[PDB]
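Hello again,

I reread your note about wanting to compare the complex against the isolated chains. To keep things tidy I'm splitting this into two emails, and this first one only covers the full assembly. Below are the input lines as submitted, including protein chains and any nucleic acid or small-molecule components. They are followed by the predicted structure of everything together. The single-chain runs will come separately.
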Amino acid sequence: RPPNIVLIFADDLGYGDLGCYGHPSSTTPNLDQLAAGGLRFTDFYVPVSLATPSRAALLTGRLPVRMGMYPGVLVPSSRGGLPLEEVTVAEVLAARGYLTGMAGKWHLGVGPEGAFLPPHQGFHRFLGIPYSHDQGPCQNLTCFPPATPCDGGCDQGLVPIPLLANLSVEAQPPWLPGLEARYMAFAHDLMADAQREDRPFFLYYASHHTHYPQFSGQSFAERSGRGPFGDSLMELDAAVGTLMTAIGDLGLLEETLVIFTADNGPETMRMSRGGCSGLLRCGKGTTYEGGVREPALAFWPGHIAPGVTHELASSLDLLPTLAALAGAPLPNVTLDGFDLSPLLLGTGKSPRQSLFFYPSYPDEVRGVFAVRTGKYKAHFFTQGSAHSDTTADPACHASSSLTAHEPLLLYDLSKDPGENYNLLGATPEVLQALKQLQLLKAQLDAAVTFGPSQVARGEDPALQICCHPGCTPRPACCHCP
Amino acid sequence: RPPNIVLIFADDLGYGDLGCYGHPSSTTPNLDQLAAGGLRFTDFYVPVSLATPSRAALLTGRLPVRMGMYPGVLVPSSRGGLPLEEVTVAEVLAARGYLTGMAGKWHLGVGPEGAFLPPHQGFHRFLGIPYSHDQGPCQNLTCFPPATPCDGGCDQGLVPIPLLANLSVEAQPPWLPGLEARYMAFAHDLMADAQREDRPFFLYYASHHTHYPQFSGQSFAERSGRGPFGDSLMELDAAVGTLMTAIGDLGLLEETLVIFTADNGPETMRMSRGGCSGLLRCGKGTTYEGGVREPALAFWPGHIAPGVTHELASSLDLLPTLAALAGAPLPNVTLDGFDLSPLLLGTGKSPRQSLFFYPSYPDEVRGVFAVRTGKYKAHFFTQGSAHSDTTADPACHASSSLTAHEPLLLYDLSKDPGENYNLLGATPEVLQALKQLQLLKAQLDAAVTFGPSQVARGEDPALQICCHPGCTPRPACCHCP
Ligand SMILES: *[C@H]1O[C@H](CO)[C@@H](O[C@H]2O[C@H](CO)[C@@H](O)[C@H](O)[C@H]2NC(C)=O)[C@H](O)[C@H]1NC(C)=O
Ligand SMILES: *[C@H]1O[C@H](CO)[C@@H](O[C@H]2O[C@H](CO)[C@@H](O)[C@H](O)[C@H]2NC(C)=O)[C@H](O)[C@H]1NC(C)=O
Ligand SMILES: [Mg+2]
Ligand SMILES: [Mg+2]
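Full-complex prediction:
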């Protein structure tokens, strides 16, 4: 039968944050053990280094511009959302009869009467926050018990963060030192109900770690030895340990595929309360490797042998791989990913040779910003971001503005993953890579027409979720902790 | 009985070059397996990030300025050398009756009739090159067989590189695609003779990898998928695999302690033919973490359990640990390291709380440049280096000149290992760290008197080794390949 699937997606976590990706001070013992008994990717990517667009791509296997998920990210007042018409992974697995569930951050739209909420896009069960946890004021929230407050305040002028159960406000705001526990219990129940009914489950655990502001429950506060960002990552790692114990307990180890990855690179503007891209350059919000190249682990005892692949892979390849693996059929839409099951099961290579990267603010005159083929990556356009400010590398700062490069900038990632030495600063291998990259951009730009933007549909304060509907004064009357 | 000891010391290799320290493209399967069954350090250091001074410190357990090993490094014409009077590790183990042997780079002086060569400082056996392999012309050497030449030429105006056997020129220059093989065989014989005579051996394998220029034998050329720097590191890794097979073969696994580390950070001026410091800042020649913080593995089946320590350690601590472990007595000299055996054997903590860092060009008016206590590191002086040029971080370049900092620059390495956020840009933990660091520098600077420099004793071309003594014209007549 099709396997049970657990998909864990961390938030704003970098390529060099796990212990097993080199960090000297992180504490992530469950993830290290999951890498030690599974496949660790060195070259897995996401196509855009922001939250919404990354989350859309993972769930539909489709580049975000195809469906209007740009520019920037959605906010609480947002009129727009991932069209209902797109077929998510949960829609696909639901129809093969999976009990589907999601815990955590959705950030894929809310809408008039919550029409874009997960329960409309194929999850049977949903306990979570519908957008990032810092999108609503937090100067009064506790981030670390007993009463260490969240740092800095978060977004102002908005309803507190709502924890939701399907479409109902279960709390507003929730108590952050307790979210993990709520989420483990929801996960545990979903698994056990699925055993109960003889059916495979699909759990989508989209953690809030390690997005700003950092938080954790008391068993982690001040125990990772890397400060708040670590306490928070140690908690995500202990949630993973929990899912894994529960998989043990129900005797489901060899029947569950478990993937871990993250939506985008670190927010280095948070300084030492943000993540680390390791040897890679820059972070969140850019098309440099540090923003789009993420950690990725695939673990399935008895099906995937412990190792390290350098094959190309993308979050875009998850719907199709999982569809394949569960004998479910693919939507009748154009897809930008591929089935990676041969690579997972060790009977093949990855079919993916290229990757296309779009910036946070794309546009049809400029098209794709960077393309990777084999070991080479070309950048046609370059640009820093305020999510990546504060590091010593000036190309990452928001003062590095949009600059065009013709001839393109060319890096061989196998020797210069750090993207330091432009090879066009000659050889025949180089001229052949340049001609291929130039043609893959012109091909893609000529063939993709952007979907009309969801984010420019604007904002309506009246779409903000409220615990005490119709109350007054808005937004402070919404609440019910 | 005291264990057999193998000490492997790589050259110009960075903290993020091993596969197990995060690199995405290196191929180092034996070292990864050695980490997987042993202790991987995250915070091991060397006190100066140049070759000579690092090599002096490791062998004597003493800060290089105590014995005149500054500034810069020794050259072939150098009149000076590590005084005979210093007691090396090999001297110490010899007197407890170890069969002692060294293969590889010595760079600790040559002298009039080779008075500073290893055979005078306690090794019974020596097959190697007495200084770096690029210190003599290489435009005509082959670096990768069948006939790929070394890149760039190396040093000019000098005798070719001599391979030596005790004090005799066995070759000049040697064939670089064959060094590994010579070195494995010498190592194999030394082990097996030591079994034969019922005595513990001490092998000091100081590889030439991954110093410029890169080279390897044909089984590695073009097979690591990271280019020449990788082919070269893949060869060092396959030498490690060989030592390990040989340890197996003689049935010596649980009686041999094996340590791996490297003398100093990467030479990023070699660009993509140089190493990678990972998330750490800068490289070779600086007192930033990327120049002084090195990979370090301790492997001893049945004595050291597989893990990861974050305890402080230094190359300075090796003589005393090994002396302890072999029940040999310590020289009657002031030592700057400590016995780490409790940490190795899991019955203790490291005794080391502080580390003192000197620059490549030290002086008694300025004294130590950086000090680490617990998780904090202070920099009293900062400075870039031409060994670290070419990266995006401007503080590493040789155009960043010697700048004093009062108040000191203060970093908490557990949250900011990358040395980005000066904490003095307030708190009581901070003021207490500042006062302690300021006092550890003034204490050390007032108590260490520098030894008179060996390197300023000057140069005599006549000290250059010659295969065909008395020939003419010097230096090209020296040779005998
Ligand atoms: C809200 O929606 C779902 C689905 O209706 C709730 O559903 C589940 O709850 C019970 C068992 O866990 C059963 O009464 C329902 O059959 C079951 N539904 C399915 C399809 O499994 C759920 O409790 C709410 N979501 C969550 C967990 O918050
Ligand atoms: C040069 O010096 C050493 C020591 O004299 C040589 O010594 C070893 O060689 C033989 C066995 O390997 C024996 O004849 C000697 O007893 C032995 N010496 C010791 C003390 O072990 C050695 O071959 C030369 N160095 C090397 C290996 O190059
Ligand atoms: Mg995100
Ligand atoms: Mg060196």
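For quick reference: The two ends of chain A are 42 Å apart (CA to CA).

B.
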